[PDB]
Swiss-Prot record, chain A:
Protein's job: Required for normal vault structure. Vaults are multi-subunit structures that may act as scaffolds for proteins involved in signal transduction. Vaults may also play a role in nucleo-cytoplasmic transport. Down-regulates IFNG-mediated STAT1 signaling and subsequent activation of JAK. Down-regulates SRC activity and signaling through MAP kinases.
Full-protein interval shown: 625 to 714 of 861
Protein name: Major vault protein
Protein source organism: Rattus norvegicus (Rat)
PTM annotation: Phosphorylated on Tyr residues after EGF stimulation. Dephosphorylated by PTPN11.
Gene (name only): Mvp
Residues joined by cross-link Glycyl lysine isopeptide (Lys-Gly) (interchain with G-Cter in SUMO2): 80
Assembly and binders: The vault ribonucleoprotein particle is a huge (400 A x 670 A) cage structure of 12.9 MDa. It consists of a dimer of half-vaults, with each half-vault comprising 39 identical major vault protein (MVP) chains, PARP4 and one or more vault RNAs (vRNAs). Interacts with TEP1. Interacts with PTEN and activated MAPK1. The phosphorylated protein interacts with the SH2 domains of PTPN11 and SRC. Interacts with APEX1. May interact with ZNF540.
Compartmental location: Cytoplasm; Nucleus
Entry text on domains: MVP 3 mediates interaction with PTEN.
Signal peptide (UniProt feature, chain positions): none
Domain of life: Eukaryota
Swiss-Prot record, chain C:
Name listed for the protein in its UniProt record: Major vault protein
Role description: Required for normal vault structure. Vaults are multi-subunit structures that may act as scaffolds for proteins involved in signal transduction. Vaults may also play a role in nucleo-cytoplasmic transport. Down-regulates IFNG-mediated STAT1 signaling and subsequent activation of JAK. Down-regulates SRC activity and signaling through MAP kinases.
Entry domain remark: MVP 3 mediates interaction with PTEN. MVP 4 mediates interaction with PARP4.
Compartment(s) where it occurs, according to its Swiss-Prot or TrEMBL record: Cytoplasm; Nucleus
Source organism (scientific name): Rattus norvegicus (Rat)
Superkingdom of origin organism: Eukaryota
Subunit structure comment from the entry: The vault ribonucleoprotein particle is a huge (400 A x 670 A) cage structure of 12.9 MDa. It consists of a dimer of half-vaults, with each half-vault comprising 39 identical major vault protein (MVP) chains, PARP4 and one or more vault RNAs (vRNAs). Interacts with TEP1. Interacts with PTEN and activated MAPK1. The phosphorylated protein interacts with the SH2 domains of PTPN11 and SRC. Interacts with APEX1. May interact with ZNF540.
Gene, per the UniProt record: Mvp
UniProt PTM: Phosphorylated on Tyr residues after EGF stimulation. Dephosphorylated by PTPN11.
Length: 90, 131, 90, 49
């Protein structure tokens, strides 16, 4: 703690409450800087959610396409037996 | 000198120059080891104004603990911060008047930049929106 | 000092800066081990205002328990949260 | 703050890069499974013809 022996004064602590630089541009650019900091965090969240939805879209398309392949397979078999009946018919 | 908590409002600013207001309650009560000892009462009266002392001091603890903290770190975890600021790392105590802050309820945080709260609220809004 | 619950309204805000209002009832009653003991009554009167004390304190418990919680987590499970906030975990 | 701008910009470009390469790899995987199902389908089709 600070001490002033001449009067016996003792500063146990020094709370700070404000800093106000005269240049308006300093605080303005600083506040814009942190504002753009949270702005690029939320933008990072935007790109993250976007790429995520694109990923689930990817898996959904590949899965549903695989489903098309399965239906094409079963339809191919039924089509084959149908070809049996048709060839016998002709 | 009963428990009846008194509310307090002290402004502070982050190291990254981001001003913010606070609404912060203070739980408080004076300990009494004995009715019998006059000296503890002398401690009780040693302060010209215990509420002003406790407010300026705890506010010094808050501005001090938080200004050191980055504005990289200001979210819900800040509630963990000030709570550890008021309390000794291992309840708050002021020996000179025997004051004891058992706890410090927080009720509001209101940063001066409209853009901060607006972008934040839009951010969570877009969070439930993307859900 | 009977059971008659009193309603309470305390605002809180999530760590993600999302403000929200609350309507929250409080069930309450004073225990009495004995009519015989004056000291327990001295406890009953020790508070300048038990309702204001209980409100500010429990509200401190709520704002404290919830502010620590993410706004990622605010749904119906929050009812589980505050209920475990007011009550001692075991 | 401009250095922060270029940093965040190049960072987002980096995550965009990884996202594109990853999602493309996902396309390759879906193309693989689809290639196998297409192959079995070719079995049924060739037998049909």
């Amino acid at each position: 703690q600070a001490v002033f022996p001449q009067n016996g004064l003792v500063v146990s602590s020094v709370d700070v409450q404000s800093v106000e630089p005269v240049d308006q541009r300093t605080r303005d650019a600083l506040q814009r800087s942190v504002q753009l900091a949270i702005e690029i965090t939320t933008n990072s969240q935007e790109a993250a959610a976007k790429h995520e939805a694109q990923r689930l879209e990817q898996e959904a398309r590949g899965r549903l396409e695989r489903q098309k392949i399965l239906d094409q397979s079963e339809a191919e078999k039924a089509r084959k037996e149908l070809l049996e009946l048709e060839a016998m018919s002709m | 000198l009963g428990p009846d908590f008194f509310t307090d409002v002290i402004t502070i600013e982050t190291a990254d120059h981001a001003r913010l207001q606070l609404q912060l309650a203070y739980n408080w009560h004076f300990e009494l080891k004995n009715r019998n000892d006059p000296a503890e009462a002398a401690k009780l009266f040693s302060v010209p104004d215990f509420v002003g002392d406790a407010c300026k001091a705890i506010a010094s603890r808050v501005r001090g603990a938080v200004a050191s903290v980055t504005f990289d770190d200001f979210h819900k975890n800040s509630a963990r911060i000030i709570r550890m600021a008021v309390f000794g790392f291992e309840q708050a105590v002021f020996p000179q008047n025997g004051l004891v802050v058992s706890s410090v309820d927080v009720q509001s945080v209101e940063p001066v930049d409209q853009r901060t709260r607006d972008a934040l609220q839009r951010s969570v809004q877009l969070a439930i929106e993307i859900t």
